[PDB]
Amino acid sequence: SLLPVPYTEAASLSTGSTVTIKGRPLVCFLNEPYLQVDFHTEMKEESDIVFHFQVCFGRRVVMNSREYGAWKQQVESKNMPFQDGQEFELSISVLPDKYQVMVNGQSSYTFDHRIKPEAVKMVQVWRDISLTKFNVSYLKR
Ligand SMILES: CCN1C(=O)C=CC1=O
Ligand SMILES: CCN1C(=O)C=CC1=O
């Protein structure tokens, strides 16, 4: 809807930062839509990825990093709090030791830092969703 997808926004993250995304799947879970959020080290899409979050709605969630052009060890979770045909609010918080991902207010996934959050310069949100809101909190030093 409101925001274009793929959506790209230059960003800076540090401990205490929060990335909030509000959106909705474009098709029924039965047709398996995806959602992907990538934290890049450069403004270019072929750059390394500090945190890659991919949701196969109704199936699994996969998380990884791409360092020096190579994907590393994948982490998969079968935890699936997303609701079929519903709007969702995804919140990603930067803790000192890891990212904590909340879905509609409930802790659902965590991912220990492999590269310092300070290396992030861009965030891209894409795949089968409409995006109504995207916000990065620049509250802390
Ligand atoms: C929850 C029922 N539903 C779907 O499965 C896709 C759109 C919708 O409203
Ligand atoms: C290499 C494995 N992988 C992909 O191909 C996309 C995300 C991921 O972890």
Curated annotation (Swiss-Prot):
CDD domains: GLECT (cd00070)
Name of protein: Galectin-10
GO cellular component terms given for this protein: collagen-containing extracellular matrix; cytosol
Location of the Galectin domain: 5-137
GO molecular function, one term: identical protein binding
Biological source species: Homo sapiens
Keywords: Acetylation, Cytoplasm, Lectin
Gene3D superfamilies: 2.60.120.200
